[PDB]
Every structure is written in C-alpha cells, then in structure tokens.
Amino acid sequence: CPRFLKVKNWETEVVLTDTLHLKSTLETGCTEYICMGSIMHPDVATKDQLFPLAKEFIDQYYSSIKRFGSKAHMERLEEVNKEIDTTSTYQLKDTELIYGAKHAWRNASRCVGRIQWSKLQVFDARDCTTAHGMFNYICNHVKYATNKGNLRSAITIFPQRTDGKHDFRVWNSQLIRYAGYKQPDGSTLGDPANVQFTEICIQQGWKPPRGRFDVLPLLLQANGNDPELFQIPPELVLEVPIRHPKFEWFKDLGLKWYGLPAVSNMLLEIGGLEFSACPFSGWYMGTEIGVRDYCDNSRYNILEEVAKKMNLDMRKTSSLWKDQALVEINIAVLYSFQSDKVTIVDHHSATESFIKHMENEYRCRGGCPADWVWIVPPMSGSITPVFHQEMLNYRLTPSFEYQPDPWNTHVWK
Amino acid sequence: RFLKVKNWETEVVLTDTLHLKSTLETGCTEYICMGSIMHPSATKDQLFPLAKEFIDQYYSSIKRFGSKAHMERLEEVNKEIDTTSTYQLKDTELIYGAKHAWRNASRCVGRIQWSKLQVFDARDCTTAHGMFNYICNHVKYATNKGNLRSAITIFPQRTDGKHDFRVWNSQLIRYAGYKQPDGSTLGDPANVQFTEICIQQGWKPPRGRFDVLPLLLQANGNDPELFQIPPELVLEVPIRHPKFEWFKDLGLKWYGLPAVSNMLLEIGGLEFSACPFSGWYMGTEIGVRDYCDNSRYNILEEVAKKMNLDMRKTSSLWKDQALVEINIAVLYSFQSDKVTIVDHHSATESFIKHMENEYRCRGGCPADWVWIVPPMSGSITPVFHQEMLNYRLTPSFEYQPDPWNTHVWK
Ligand code: HEM
Ligand code: HEM
Ligand SMILES: Cc1cc(N)nc2cc(-c3cncc(CN)c3)ccc12
Ligand SMILES: Cc1cc(N)nc2cc(-c3cncc(CN)c3)ccc12
Ligand SMILES: C[C@H](O)[C@H](O)[C@H]1CNc2nc(N)[nH]c(=O)c2N1
Ligand SMILES: C[C@H](O)[C@H](O)[C@H]1CNc2nc(N)[nH]c(=O)c2N1
Ligand SMILES: [Zn+2]
Secondary structure, X not given: OOOOXXXXXXXXXXXXXXXXXXXXXXXXXXXXXXXXXXXXXXXXXXXXXHHHHHHHHHHHHHHHOOOOOOHHHHHHHHXXXXXXXXXXXXXXXXXXXXXXXXXXXXXXXXXXXXXXXXOOEEEEOOOOOXXXXXHHHHHHHHHHHHHHHOOOOEEEEOOOOOOOOOOOEEOOOEOOOEOEEEOOOOOEEEOHHHHHHHHHHHHOOOOOOOOOOOEOOEEEEOOOOOOEEEOOOHHHOXXXXXXXXXXXXXXXXXXXXXXXXXXXXXXXXXXXXXXXXXXXEOOEEHHHHHHHHHHOOOOOOOHHHHHHHOOOOOOOOOXXXXXXXXXXXXXXXXXXXXXXXXXXXXXXXXXXXXXXXXXXXXXXXXXXXXXXXXXXXXXXXXXXXXXXXXXXXXXXXXXXXXXXXXXXXXXXX | OOEEEEXXXXXXXXXXXXXXXXXXXXXXXXXXXXXXXXXXXXXXXXXXXXXXHHHHHHHHHOXXXXXXXXHHHHHHHHHHHHHHOOOOOOHHXXXXXXXXXXXXXXXXXXXXXXXXXXXXXXXXXXXXXXXXXXXXXXXXXXXXXXXXXXXXXXXXOOOXXXXXXXXXXXXXXXXXXXXXXXXXXXXXXXHHHHHHHHHHOOOOOOOOOOOEOOEEEEXXXXXXXXXOOOHHHOOEEEOOOOOOHHHXXXXXXXXXXOEEOOOEEEEOOEEEOOOOEEOOEEHHHHHHHHHHOOOOOOOHHHHHHHOOOOOOOHHHOHHHHHHHHHHHHHXXXXXXXXXXXXXHHHHHHHHHHHHHHHHHHHOOOOXXXXXXXXOOOHHHOXXXXXXXXXXXXXXXXXXXXXXXXXXXXX
C-alpha cells in the first residue's frame, strides 16, 4: 500500500491525509474487485497466535504513555511472555484494560459519537464468578451511567474467554429493551425486533405482563453455565414519555422510550484477549429512536398512525406524507428528552462534532477509521456535514466485534 | 465464490455470481475500504483483448456465440486494430454498449429503465457546429414536451488524445453562477468557474439568478466555441407549493431535463470523451441537493423563515422541516405541469424490483449504497435496508478531468 491516503470534503474543500491505515490489522471483506461496504456483517487462540498479538498491543500501550523501549516496557513484555508460555494466556494490568477499552471505542468505525472516547468510565469486573454477581455489576453500571438523567458513558468488563466452554455472556442485545409478543393472528405486541429473545425469556420462566412497553429481564451467563433470569429494579430504568411541543394529541399515542442505550452483545478484543461480556453505554442520538426504533416497518411502525392524526394525504407517495411525519416524530423525541433533562443529541450537533473530531484525529493521530454508511444519519443525510465528507474505513485493534447469539452455540447443561 | 446479499427488512437473500465477471478495480483493498471516495485513484496491444471481450459478450447476448457471424466479426476487428491502431463499432454494437453502460452504472437508482434508451449516433461529427446541431436534436427529442424520454448522443471516439471531442459543460442545461464583488454568489455556486470561463470567451451574462448557460463545445481537439440553445427547446418549471401560497414568491424555478455531459463512455476499449445522456429527475436531486446544499442555492434559511420556524436551536429540526416542504413543492410543480419526475419512494421501490429482476436473469447487479440511498429520509426507503455489492463491469461510464485543466489553446 502507498504511504499516504487523502480524503476530501466536497463542501468545504478541506483535504486530510491518512497514515494510520498502515496499522490496519484485519481484512474488511472488500477486495480489489468488489466492495462489501454495505454488508452488515462481512475454539480459542493458541500460544503461538497469542504471542505477537500481545506484543503488538503492549508496544502500542507503552508508546501511548511515552515509555517505549523503557525498562518497564521490556519487563512487561517478558512477564506477558512467561505468562503465555506457562498458562497459555495472560492477564491485563488495570491501566492496560482501561487503555484497551477506551481505544476500542476510539477505533469503532461505525460510531458517530467518538469525540467522547477518552471520557469513559471503566468498571473492572474480572473478579465476577456468578450470574447473580453479573446482575450486581450491571445494576451498578446502569445506576452510575444513568445518573438521574445526566448520562455518563461507561463499560463493564466481565472475565475474558478461556477455553470457550466457560464464556461469560449477557444474552440480551441491550441491557434495557422492550418485549415483543407474536400474536396468534400475525400481529406483534410491543417491539417486533425483540420477539425471538422474549420467547427465550418466557421459556426460561419469565412471566410476561404482555404489554406494549415491558422492560425485558436480564438473561445472564457466567463461566459457561446455563443463563439465569433477573429483574432490573424498575426505579433504575429511566424512561421518557414522548410528547410534541405543538401537537397536543401526540401524547395520546402512549409512546415512551428508555434513556440509556446499552449494547450488551458485542465482544471486546484487547491484545488477542476476548471479552465476550462487556456491556457499554453512552447516550442517544435522537434519530436512533425517532427514525429507526419508531418508524422502521419491522419495528414500532407508527408512521401511519401519526400521519393520520396529522391529517395527511396518504394515497400518494409523492405527497411525501411519510417524510413529513418522520420529522415531527423526531422533533417530539428530542423535545421530550430535553424537557426531562435526559441527555440526548440531535443528528446535526452529533455529525458536526464528529467532523471536528475526525479532523483532530487526522492531525494528531494520522487518521480516523469511519464507516460512512453508518455515520450518516437515517434522515436528512445530505444536510448534515458527514454526507459530503470522504471517509476511509479500516479495522484497528483493540476493537469491538460482533459475535454469534449465545443460544445458537450454548451447550445446555 | 458465490456471494449473498440480504435485505434486513424482508429477510430476502439474493445470490451474486455476476461479480465474478469484472476485471476493473474498485479502489478498495482487503485492508482499506474506500466505498465513500468519490473518485478513487491506449495501444494496439492493449486494445484487441478488450475488443474481443466486448464482442464475445455481445454475441453471447444475442445467442449467437461461436456462430459464423461472431468468428468473422472478431477477425474483422483484429485486422482493423492491426492496420489502423483502433476500430469502429457496428451500429448494433454501439446501441448494445450504451444500454449496458447504463445497466452497469452502480450509482444509478434509475436502472429499471435501462433497455429503454434512445441512442443517437453522432460519430460522423467533425465541428463544434455539428455538435451543437446534434445536441439540439437530443434536447428536443428527450424533452418531448414534458413526457421525457431517455437518450444519449455519442460523438467520435478518442484517437490520439490530441483531438478529443468534449462538451465542457458538466450538464447541457445549467444556470450561471456569478462571484459578487462583496463576496457572495449570484445564481448557482457549482458553476461559477465554468461561468467565468464562458465570460472570458465572450459570453454576455444577464447576471441573474437563473441564466441558462451557453454550450461550450470542443471538436477534434480544437478550441471550444460558444452556442446559445434556442430558448423554446429549454423546458422549465416554476416551483410552487400546494399549501404555501407564498412559495411562488421565492421566485424559484428549475429545468425539466437532467442531461449530464461531462462523463466518458467506454466500450470494448474505445473511449467516447463526449457523450451527453439524459433521463428524468428524481425529486431530491433538485429539492435536496440543488437547493439546500450550502455550496449550492442554500435556500433552507430563506424557506424556514417564511414558515416562521424557530431557527435558534438545531434540535427544533427546522432544517428538516423546510427540506421536506421544498421537496413537496418540487414534486407538486413538475407533476402539475405534466413534466416527468419520480419521488425517491417510488424510485427506490423500482430499484429493489430491478435488483430482483437482475439477480434472477443476470446473476447480480452492481450497486453503490452510498449513492443509491436518497439524500433525505434514507431509512424509510427500501434501499436503506438492502445490502448491495459494488463492482465495476464494462461497458461503462467513467469520470474524466475538466478539459480546461488540460487543453492547450490555439
Ligand atoms: C456517548 C454518546 C454516543 C453516541 C451519541 C453514539 C452514537 C452512535 C450511533 C448513532 C451509532 C449507530 C447505532 C445504530 O445505528 O444502531 C453507534 C454505534 C456504535 N457505537 Fe457509539 N455512541 C455513543 C457512545 C458509545 C460508546 C461509549 C461506545 C463504546 C465504548 C460506543 C461504541 C459503538 C459501537 C461499537 C457501535 C457499532 C454498533 C454496531 O455495529 O452494532 N458508542 N454509536
Ligand atoms: C430515466 C430516469 C433516471 C433517473 C430517475 C436517474 C436517477 C439517478 C440519480 C438520482 C443519480 C444520482 C446522481 C447524483 O446524485 O448526482 C443517478 C446517477 C447516474 N445515472 Fe441515472 N437516472 C436516470 C437515467 C439515466 C440514464 C438515461 C443514464 C445514462 C444513459 C444514467 C446514468 C447514470 C450514471 C452514469 C450515474 C452516476 C453519475 C456519477 O457517478 O456522477 N441514468 N441517476
Ligand atoms: C454505545 C451506544 C450509544 C448509542 N447512542 N447508541 C448505540 C447503539 C448501538 C446499537 C447497534 N446496533 C444495534 C442496536 C439496536 N438497534 C444498537 C450500540 C451502542 C450504542
Ligand atoms: C442521467 C441522469 C438522470 C438523472 N435523473 N440524474 C442524473 C444525475 C447525474 C449527476 C451525477 N453526478 C453529479 C451530478 C451533478 N450534481 C449529476 C448524472 C446523470 C443523471
Ligand atoms: C463523500 C461522499 O461520497 C459524497 O458526498 C457522495 C455521498 N453520496 C452521494 N450520493 C449521491 N446520489 N450523489 C452524491 O453526490 C453523493 N455524494
Ligand atoms: C444494508 C445496510 O448495510 C443496513 O441497512 C445498514 C445501513 N446503515 C446503517 N446505519 C446505522 N447507523 N444503523 C444501521 O442499522 C444501518 N443499517
Ligand atoms: Zn469497500
């Protein structure tokens, strides 16, 4: 590969130069002859495999704290090596763990919120041994991160993977999500996105209230054991009823959402170590709720009902009734969150921050991996500054990765 | 290897095999994806294999592969490259190559229409006057009094690179843009340079907001010459709004015919440096990009002011409101004047249908999600949820440099 790669902004003319891509680690799935950039997703490491992955990471850490080549550096190297040699694995120092998590966020190509990356509260939970303990750590995470509506980004890191027969897993895709109930007639009550997991919970013994906005239980797996159900204390689940500053009838739709977005099904990879349970949280960009959660056909799909109350012509598409309802819904979502002093960012403020962020990164770091297909908002794309920004996409480590759903791989005891 | 694309809304999966047939490069590598880069970056000896590939594809298309006709065509083309360092397409070939350059345009959402293309052979052209004649005929035909018709006009192929044919306008019909002494811009800011270049060539600028630019035409590598498109051939629409009486008072208008004129058509190794093609508009092209881009007409603030919207915080989403309204007026206006147009909902529907057609009968369809997904209300259109595979098939449309950056004058 050539040393320098240039990206252009087509509305400001600014040109950046990327050299960081030279540290890329994994294959993107793209080739010389095909681009998989809109594909959503394009047994443990051996001693030999782990050795250089650990060294790669350790060198990077010591270079970050400006101690590269130092005695402490060479010693840490030697200690990691012995520990891999005799135990087939190694343990991170607290400093390294914090660094690793922060940088995995810093490296998340698909995240528009990464200007905040270095303000992340890390909760070390590698001493956890049971599902009840996981429940304890998750409740503390939720309470701290929620902070009465003044949200704070956090990650809780459970023990790494060992032989793969003892994984810690949060079976929920997010710590907080609403149930979906398939009806005998084909309709879905609540959130259709969560139907599969809800059925799992019910089989596992969950008594469902069978409502439209029932918070799902946590389904938690420690040390490779069968998962166990716990109810999140309702007082820890901050929620916002959705109203509209102009449309008084909007409240009569009975919509609400939860304040804390906390993805819990991803895998954190640091120096070749695999943390299969690492729930992390920030705060919402309005569109994640207002456009996706609410207006996706396979989600709450309320465009129709909202358009009706707006008395729009719904017989032509060229009326753009859908487009018109979408904006109002998103206005209500931002309005309700701000009114209740719960942290939320609109897609304009977010994409502008991110452009500023990306610029700083290119200048101080020599680059910033970004996935345009994900970075650009799902509404009003071209009137946000990221639309016109060229991005390069590539995989740096430490990183967050997808993993299979645990019910597909789990060996039931 | 076969490749699967999934639609996450319908859960439908299609299997791509056609991608095995490309040879050109996309710009990505295994380690870096450049899917969001706008522009990633002959001889006798190079020419024949390219020719052989295209001839083979053609006779395969008409189910006469390995036929007598096929065999001789191939030798005819080899002898001609041998003895002239180039060759000339048959008319049938020219037509087949042009339709398939459109079929292979990964960034074009309108490709369901692809085999409905009127192909104008202008390869006998020699002067800028001829070009102008050919272009007026195109414009008049494709406009069709509002019932627009897809068309392309193909001027002589590149020979030695010293004698290119070029349409220096980026589109046949665009409005002028003027640098105002106080720093602002009158008209269309995307065209300020080209406008100054016309003024420098002797064009007398009305210095208004919607001045149709002259044709600047280059033939056989000569200096370019100015021509005024007869006004009655230029179909335009005054933009008004079905609810907002005051929208007409903004004085806004646009042209009915989108006719891109600065790209390059490549067929079997031949380069057609001048090949204006036109179709009809998707609403958002005018209503989102042309009017609301900051480096364009930048009219969002004006419209939102008449709507009496709170413009003090971004989170009131006033920009998003004005945007939808502008795009309503645009669709309304065209349809009222019976000028062909398509809204991004219907267009994206059509395209998902096209993909299904193309996977079924052709084993795939190249597509650029970055460009295919509309610049407003993305995820409430079906293409947002459609995985797409991009790859470059030939015959094709490519980009070329602006001719003023290369041309040595007189
Ligand atoms: C603090 C405010 C944050 C904002 C505004 C934000 C914004 C976003 C948005 C809009 C997405 C796309 C989500 C979707 O379309 O479903 C996203 C994805 C993502 N974010 Fe951030 N995020 C924030 C915090 C964080 C934190 C704290 C982390 C990790 C430490 C993180 C890591 C990620 C990752 C890994 C993805 C990709 C998820 C996937 O592919 O499924 N984000 N973010
Ligand atoms: C018939 C109705 C058509 C519609 C509704 C349509 C729609 C579009 C749109 C919205 C774009 C994106 C352009 C942009 O955002 O700047 C595009 C791109 C493109 N179209 Fe189509 N188009 C049509 C016909 C055609 C025809 C007739 C041709 C050629 C014979 C064509 C070839 C292309 C090419 C080569 C691009 C890529 C332009 C670039 O890369 O800059 N299209 N089309
Ligand atoms: C940290 C964080 C913050 C934030 N505002 N949104 C997120 C959204 C996701 C996310 C990714 N894929 C799917 C979903 C569920 N539709 C959510 C993950 C993490 C997020
Ligand atoms: C055939 C055709 C039809 C249509 N409706 N729009 C087009 C738009 C373009 C196009 C592509 N890139 C840049 C521009 C100028 N902003 C225009 C090219 C051809 C088009
Ligand atoms: C940087 C980015 O590639 C650029 O803004 C692209 C994004 N997608 C686009 N899509 C379309 N249809 N037209 C465009 O001009 C662009 N611009
Ligand atoms: C097909 C496509 O990759 C898929 O629909 C993606 C597109 N971009 C996205 N962007 C974000 N932020 N979130 C998403 O879920 C998606 N979905
Ligand atoms: Zn790619």
